Write a protein that holds these residues in place. Structure first.
Motif, short mmCIF file in Angstrom:
data_model
loop_
_atom_site.label_atom_id
_atom_site.label_comp_id
_atom_site.label_asym_id
_atom_site.label_seq_id
_atom_site.Cartn_x
_atom_site.Cartn_y
_atom_site.Cartn_z
N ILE A 136 -5.09 -7.54 1.31
CA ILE A 136 -5.48 -6.82 -0.07
C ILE A 136 -7.25 -7.39 -0.28
O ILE A 136 -7.55 -8.26 0.14
N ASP A 163 2.22 5.36 0.49
CA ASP A 163 1.34 6.54 1.06
C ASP A 163 2.09 7.98 0.48
O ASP A 163 2.86 8.18 1.38
N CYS A 223 -9.90 -5.08 -1.38
CA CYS A 223 -10.73 -3.66 -2.06
C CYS A 223 -11.34 -3.57 -3.22
O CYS A 223 -11.21 -4.91 -3.24
N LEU A 226 0.67 -0.90 -0.32
CA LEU A 226 0.11 0.10 -0.17
C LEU A 226 0.54 1.20 -0.62
O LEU A 226 1.54 1.59 0.91
N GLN A 282 -5.41 6.08 -2.86
CA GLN A 282 -4.55 4.84 -1.88
C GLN A 282 -3.91 4.54 -3.50
O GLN A 282 -4.45 4.84 -4.50
N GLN A 303 0.63 -2.11 -9.62
CA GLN A 303 0.08 -0.51 -9.00
C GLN A 303 -1.09 0.29 -9.43
O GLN A 303 -0.91 0.88 -10.70
N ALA A 358 0.32 -3.67 2.67
CA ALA A 358 -1.22 -3.87 2.89
C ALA A 358 -1.36 -4.22 4.26
O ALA A 358 -2.37 -3.38 5.13
N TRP A 382 -2.37 0.23 -4.42
CA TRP A 382 -2.15 -1.13 -3.92
C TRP A 382 -1.20 -1.91 -5.19
O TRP A 382 -1.08 -2.52 -5.77
N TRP A 433 5.68 3.16 -0.39
CA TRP A 433 5.29 2.02 -0.16
C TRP A 433 5.74 1.19 1.34
O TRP A 433 5.68 2.54 1.92
#
Length: 115
Positions: free
Chosen positions: A62, A17, A64, A15, A87, A81, A26, A89, A23
């Motif tokens: 993960i 930031d 989402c 994940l 955000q 990605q 996650a 991933w 990175w």
């Protein structure tokens, strides 16, 4: 079975930031790749990713949802990605087939969701 999965790839989900520009694991802190699979829920014409570690612990790294809004970027042959809301991933893969298989299902989602 819970919904209809699409694909399955080996990789350690990450994940981003943007707040710090980098990175970040996650799931939890520890890492060791993870089996991420996509969910094809046509009942609502929506998709979502779901992956867990490959250890006795079994933790989802993960979880989402993707709906005609996310487009796989694929930084490298072994990386995926995508930017959804705010955000990112970025999951790192271990084998070529992994990163290749992962996009397989995903690409299908973004194609059956966008048009």
């Amino acid at each position: 079975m819970s919904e209809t999965v699409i694909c399955s790839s080996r990789a350690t989900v990450m994940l981003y930031d943007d707040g710090n520009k980098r990175w970040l694991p996650a799931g939890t802190g520890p890492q060791a790749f993870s089996r991420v699979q996509i969910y094809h829920n046509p009942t609502a014409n929506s998709f979502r990713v779901v992956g867990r570690k490959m250890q006795p612990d079994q933790q989802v790294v993960i979880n989402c949802a993707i709906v005609r809004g996310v487009k796989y970027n694929q930084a490298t042959p072994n990386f995926h990605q995508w930017r959804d809301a705010r955000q990112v991933w970025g999951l790192n893969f271990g084998s070529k087939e992994d990163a290749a298989q992962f996009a397989a299902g995903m690409a299908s989602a973004l194609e059956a969701l966008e048009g």
